[PDB]
Design a binder for this molecule. Sequence first.
Ligand SMILES: [Cl-]
Ligand SMILES: [Cl-]
Ligand SMILES: [Cl-]
Length: 300
Amino acid sequence: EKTVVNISKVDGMPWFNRMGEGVVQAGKEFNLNASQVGPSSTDAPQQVKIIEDLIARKVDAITIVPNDANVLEPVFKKARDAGIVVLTNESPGQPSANWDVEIIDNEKFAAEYVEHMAKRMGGKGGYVIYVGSLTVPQHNLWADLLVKYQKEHYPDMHEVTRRMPVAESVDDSRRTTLDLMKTYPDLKAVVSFGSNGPIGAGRAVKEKRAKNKVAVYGMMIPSQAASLIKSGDITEGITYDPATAGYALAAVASTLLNGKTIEPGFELKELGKAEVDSDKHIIRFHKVLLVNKDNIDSLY
Ligand SMILES: [Cl-]
Ligand SMILES: [Cl-]
Ligand SMILES: [Cl-]
């Protein structure tokens, strides 16, 4: 069978474990020898090393959620030059990827964050954004759009500080949330695009008994966030199922390895039709998931 290997941002995360379930499922469905490698840390050279080993192994396709788009470019070009398909998730515009695959529409996702935040604080107040790092591509693109949307809808909202690179750490997210709540009495919402961020922020909000005024929104695995969703310390997840991303990556790899070419009109039985931007080589699905007390038990 054709060999497909997915590479997460880092091992030891419920988010990426869920992704791997989708990879393994696609391997069954598409007759692939599929696997997922979790790096030992989020430092991008660890992903480069894994990719060098996969090129040496001469695998058929490498799929990856990059920690840094630019750090990986040379090794992605080395893979392509070797005849290996390179696919990303969370890296729209990655120059050497055959395609980037996304599970939500960026514009819509940002809007949903701001509208949900604005409703609860009456369109006025402070907020902050947590990102996984200052260079991770997709978190920063989402943050940029969220702020831009905010400024052209709710001028009485504002970032209390520039974005904080804490979203992959419960500790760092908790500490930052405690600090910012003490500093900014008008802080009313914390947004995290990393999945550990709402856990840390939610724990801080719980400790200070602050859930009435300080809302917490973000990306999350529902089961990991369940205790805090149920106690109201996490207000809402605005996210997607990363198993769908893992699956879609491997499904697109299958298409390409079978000699087919991706163009507008592309569809996956299990997902539906994607939008396909041939100029930027981005395949988008529209599968945003809202995680609230009302559906927390219906999820993974
Ligand atoms: Cl992993
Ligand atoms: Cl903690
Ligand atoms: Cl918790």
